[PDB]
RNA sequence: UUUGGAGAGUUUGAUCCUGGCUCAGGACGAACGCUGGCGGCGUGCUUAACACAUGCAAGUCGAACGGAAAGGCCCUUUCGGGGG
């Protein structure tokens, strides 16, 4: 199962010694919901070629961003593009609070409490680019031990350590209803 | 060791950036338009620190003192009232 959202349809238009060229371009996220991210922007002739070739944008580009809980690990200074954008991973319930394409990619991605705040030139698709930036940033904790030469205890605080054995229990009762 | 960030529209033939304007929310000691049933609970001259009809919004102590205007009492009465 995919999630694809549409994002922003667009209206572009060339010209040539006759007049003008209308043309359409589009961009849509797809995502799996583990934290599995993909996105493809394409132009075409019409709304169904570009949401075609959108997807299949999406699908041959993906990335995997390794989430804890069901929440980001740290705060990501999402600098890329043309915009800024920051994230803050959040409480449960509270949400994903985010502005249009973080919100698109967000969802997509799967996470569901998290802030972030966009901060200039919001145009979508360089919004959509630092999004993805910021995203393939973040740090695995278990990673960064093993780069450091350092053990998990000493490198990660107890609270996230918690965070993660109740997230791992909960993965396991999820396992053993599914095959049960 | 715990609480908590939304953007959208608008330049161009078409983008990107910057940048300007506008809107999606909360709040009013608020006023006007329409509507309108009760009860509960607060609130109520922000401008003219403008002049202000009337009345209310500062009184208590004879066991501090002299006295008795009006009342209570008794001796009196011509019923004007006279003593304490
Ligand atoms: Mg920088
Ligand atoms: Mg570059
Ligand atoms: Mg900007
Ligand atoms: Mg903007
Ligand atoms: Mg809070
Ligand atoms: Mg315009
Ligand atoms: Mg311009
Ligand atoms: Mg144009
Ligand atoms: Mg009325
Ligand atoms: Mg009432
Ligand atoms: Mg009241
Ligand atoms: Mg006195």
Redesign the pocket.
């Known amino acids: 199962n995919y999630i694809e959202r549409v994002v922003s349809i667009?209206?572009?238009?060339?010209?040539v010694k006759g007049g003008?060229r209308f043309s359409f371009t589009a961009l849509v996220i797809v995502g799996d919901g583990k934290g599995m991210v993909g996105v493809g922007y394409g132009k075409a002739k019409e709304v169904p070629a570009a949401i075609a070739k959108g997807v299949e944008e999406a699908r041959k580009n993906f990335f995997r961003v390794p989430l804890i809980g069901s929440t980001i690990t740290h705060?990501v200074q999402g600098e890329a593009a043309?915009?800024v954008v920051?994230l803050?991973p959040?409480?449960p319930g509270?949400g994903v609070?985010?502005?249009?394409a973080?919100r698109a990619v967000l969802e997509c991605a799967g996470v569901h409490d998290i802030?972030?705040?966009?901060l200039?030139?919001?145009?979508?698709?360089?919004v959509v680019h630092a999004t993805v930036a910021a995203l393939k940033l973040l740090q695995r904790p278990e990673e960064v031990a093993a780069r450091r030469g350092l053990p998990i205890e000493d490198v990660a605080?107890?609270?996230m350590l918690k965070a993660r054995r109740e997230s791992e229990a909960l993965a396991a009762a999820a396992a053993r209803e599914g095959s049960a």
Do not use: C, E, Q
């Open positions: 667009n209206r572009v238009s060339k010209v003008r705060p043309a915009g920051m803050r959040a409480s509270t609070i985010a502005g249009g973080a802030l972030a705040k966009s200039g030139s919001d145009n979508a698709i360089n605080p107890a609270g």
